[PDB]
């Protein structure tokens, strides 16, 4: 199967651009796109591209999972197995959620830290992201006694200083994210 | 991942200039630029640069968060991991807030100093910066008569003499700052 | 260079359908499409296809001249030379001209037959096509009372019986044709 | 030096698109663009691109000669020699010239054929193009006793059937071409 990455970023703001770049050593660098998740995009249905494919400008419809088969002319199907799943995320669609820290943004080593995303928007899911990590954490949003939709991320004992932002998303659109929270720098002393 | 910095300062006055610099040890100093909080200005759109890159004059449209990947030819992605956050803040957009100290400009060593940023403008976030330390503090504004918005930065024990300034910014654009407040030098006896 | 053809016909009625086909012996049947007389319709913009490609329904925006390069991976350009001209003409846009024969529908073998296309419309170019022969003839229109535009196609000696039709087209759009004239069968005794 | 080609066509209609694709075996596929001829384009001045560079939409300012240096980090200049000159042509800017044949579009083998481009537009140069040949012929436009600017291409004795089109261009813009002539099919019997 081919190796497909997003350049320069899989996480792209609304109105931005992204290039789906694929490489295939077995066969040739002629690929066919496949959008698995997200809003249906007809102009992406069985679309054949060379080396790379430029999505611009990026709309909320482009958020979702993509896969690519490489041209392998001397195989039974003349096309290869699907590539690695490539998830494209679109941000800056809804109001940004507020991010706060318990007990506070500054705590000692070995102390449990728990972040909270809050919003007046009826987000179904909250996505916490840390600067440095590409692995995003996602938790369901639960209503509070204030009229806000909230989720609490328990990070556990502190090991080193980090910086967090969070996003909100409605049902049926997990990759269509809101504006990012203001950066919350967790300092570990 | 590459090391990116803004020079002479990430906090750059409108009409001023800034240089996006980056250095990459593991590979080659060919860097691709991308903005995370919105679509970039045209001369920053699809921008790959060599070593450093000069922006002049600086406009409000340059304010935001940026990342860079260094050229890593012999890797799956042919590019490095996202660099350290490359933030650009533009000042001089709104009238400067007033900065006051508590208990005052001169204080005893080990005593608590609290700096209040206050304006008639309806800022959402005040930012307290210090001379010599490229580390800004963020706080939300609060209403209080006489029809003013205010934020109190408690710095804890005062160890050494330090001069401060503060900027006002509105809710939808946290990287677009007001004119700098008059400098407040705190002396420590 | 690849061989490209339109099927069932390059002369295709508006609202009708056409299939762009191509075959490439020297390399692979992966073809890139491009229009030479203007920017292409969106589903033809950045269009790479496998073997053949179906257009339905056909709109006036599809009319024009096209080329195709077959996939030639192990060459400097990684693509072939431009194919044979792939022309699309759309009919049914204007009222049909009237087609007349000289001396008439039935003629002696070896005699000269001249076909006049005539309309009240101010066409710039008349196009004479024949049933069975995928080769159209082009001629400019000429003013003459009763306030009509006309073109005379001299076919020379009449060898065999053949049915003709003609289309009118205006100066700025030579690939956008009128409705077909009533068929004129020429008999040869 | 790198090998740089235009995809899918160096000859691109106004409002169209073209991709400057470069390959470099010695060093890496990081290139820097250079526009030698044509109208000055600042956003193309020392612009660094990866693998390919997409010009879209194409304007008359993009017509001209391009060269590319490849990234060769362990060389005295860290960049290589300029690539092959890549001429990009923009068509469909002015009215199309008329193309006629002397003595006629149909002649016997070994007969001298001479084409003529005519126009009411003050073209300084006429460019004859043949279907199949990438080599364009250019002749200066000379005024006639009719008020038209004309040029005569003497092709000499006929060898095989061909198809010709022609373009017109004004002074100082040799690669900014008009609309193509109607195709003139020279038949050789
Ligand atoms: C963090 O939570 C875990 C689980 O309840 C607990 O075992 C641990 O003692 C806590 N750490 C601190 C510093 O409170
Ligand atoms: C001074 O600040 C320190 C740290 O912020 C705090 O522990 C202390 O209680 C404060 N004292 C007063 C009098 O506010
Ligand atoms: C008939 O047509 C042929 C070829 O076009 C021409 O040589 C001949 O002179 C014509 N005869 C008449 C009577 O028009
Ligand atoms: C074509 O022109 C050349 C040069 O004048 C001449 O030698 C030749 O005989 C001409 N051919 C014909 C068929 O007239």
UniProtKB/Swiss-Prot annotation, chains A, B, C, D:
Gene source species: Homo sapiens (Human)
Keywords: Cell membrane, Disulfide bond, Endosome, Glycoprotein, Immunoglobulin domain, Membrane, Receptor, Repeat, Signal, Transmembrane, Transmembrane helix
Residue numbers on the Extracellular membrane side: 1-189
Function: Receptor for non-classical major histocompatibility class Ib HLA-G molecules. Recognizes HLA-G in complex with B2M/beta-2 microglobulin and a nonamer self-peptide (peptide-bound HLA-G-B2M). In decidual NK cells, binds peptide-bound HLA-G-B2M complex and triggers NK cell senescence-associated secretory phenotype as a molecular switch to promote vascular remodeling and fetal growth in early pregnancy. May play a role in balancing tolerance and antiviral-immunity at maternal-fetal interface by keeping in check the effector functions of NK, CD8+ T cells and B cells.
GO biological processes: cellular defense response; immune response-regulating signaling pathway; negative regulation of natural killer cell mediated cytotoxicity; positive regulation of cellular senescence; positive regulation of natural killer cell cytokine production; signal transduction
GO CC annotations, alphabetized: early endosome membrane; membrane; plasma membrane
Glycosylation sites: 112, 146
Record-level Gene Ontology MF annotations: MHC class Ib receptor activity; transmembrane signaling receptor activity
Residues of the Ig-like C2-type domain: 15-75, 110-173
Tissue specificity of this protein: Expressed in decidual NK cells and innate lymphoid cell type I (ILC1). Expressed in a subset of peripheral NK cells.
The encoding gene: KIR2DL4
Record's protein name: Killer cell immunoglobulin-like receptor 2DL4
Shown part of the complete sequence: 30 to 218 of 377
Cellular compartment(s): Cell membrane; Early endosome membrane
Family: Belongs to the immunoglobulin superfamily.
Covalent S-S links between cysteines: 22-68, 117-166
The organism's place on the tree of life at top rank: Eukaryota
Subunit structure: Interacts with peptide-bound HLA-G-B2M heterotrimeric complex. Interacts with ARRB2.
Topology class, membrane: Single-pass type I membrane protein
